Amino acid sequence: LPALKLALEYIVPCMNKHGICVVDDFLGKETGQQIGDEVRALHGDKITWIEGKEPGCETIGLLMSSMDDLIRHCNGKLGSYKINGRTKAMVACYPGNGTGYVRHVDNPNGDGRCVTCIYYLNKDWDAKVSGGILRIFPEGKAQFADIEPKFDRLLFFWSDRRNPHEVQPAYATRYAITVWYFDADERARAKVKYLTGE
Numbered sequence: 330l331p332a333l334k335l336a337l338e339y340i341v342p343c344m345n346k347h348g349i350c351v352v353d354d355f356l357g358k359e360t361g362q363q364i365g366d367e368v369r370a371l372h373g374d375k376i377t378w379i380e381g382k383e384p385g386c387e388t389i390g391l392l393m394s395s396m397d398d399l400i401r402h403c404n405g406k407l408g409s410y411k412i413n414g415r416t417k418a419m420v421a422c423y424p425g426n427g428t429g430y431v432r433h434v435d436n437p438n439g440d441g442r443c444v445t446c447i448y449y450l451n452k453d454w455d456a457k458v459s460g461g462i463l464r465i466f467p468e469g470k471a472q473f474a475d476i477e478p479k480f481d482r483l484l485f486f487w488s489d490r491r492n493p494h495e496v497q498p499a500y501a502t503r504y505a506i507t508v509w510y511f512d513a514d515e516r517a518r519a520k521v522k523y524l525t526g527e
């Protein structure tokens with residue numbers, strides 16, 4: 330599906346109906362492999378915050394710009410949100426050391442973030458061997474979903490209490506990149522609570 334059709338015919342209806350949406354083969358093999366190389370070159374869990382213009386991060390920047398265009402093509406149809414910006418990218422290297430993340434909500438208290446977008450980099454990742462599954466518990470539903478951290482897979486989900494999630498421990502190093510998109514009204518309300526530079 331082309332980006333306009335992908336947004337309007339798949340991401341929008343899927344987010345509105347389920348609050349979670351998986352796009353496989355988002356950028357293609359060549360672009361995905363370049364992003365994987367850049368992330369491995371960056372120098373317990375290791376988190377680095379990336380704007381996209383740093384040396385050796387050009388293809389990470391391309392991923393970010395591509396996620397931005399896809400969101401733009403949703404034409405304000407994602408929930409009631411007016412999306413006008415996003416965070417930097419959280420580039421994460423998770424060692425396979427048998428630690429996980431307890432069930433949590435990314436934005437439980439109105440900090441501005443409305444959509445979590447995760448891009449995965451793990452080729453031939455077997456969850457039954459290496460672990461690292463993301464388990465999402467959509468609010469009020471009888472079912473939950475385990476998401477495999479597949480190479481070139483883009484995951485969207487609402488960042489608020491609709492999607493508590495936990496991360497299973499892993500036995501091989503996992504790499505993922507996350508951005509969060511802001512709702513204009515929520516982000517404006519968050520900014521009345523303090524002063525510049527604080």
Ligand SMILES: Cc1cccnc1CN1CCC2(CC1)C(=O)N(c1ccc(-c3ccccc3)cc1)C(=O)N2c1ncccn1
Pocket residue numbers: 376416430433434435436440441442463494496509
């Ligand atoms: C690790 C993981 C894997 C899969 C799914 N979820 C998670 C965890 N969640 C995802 C990552 C998590 C915790 C929740 C998270 O949202 N923000 C975060 C917090 C605040 C803003 C912000 C930015 C601008 C304005 C307002 C707010 C942006 C991001 C972290 O800094 N985070 C984090 N996480 C681990 C180590 C350090 N920091």
Ligand SMILES: [Mn+2]
Pocket residue numbers: 433434435494
């Ligand atoms: Mn999370």
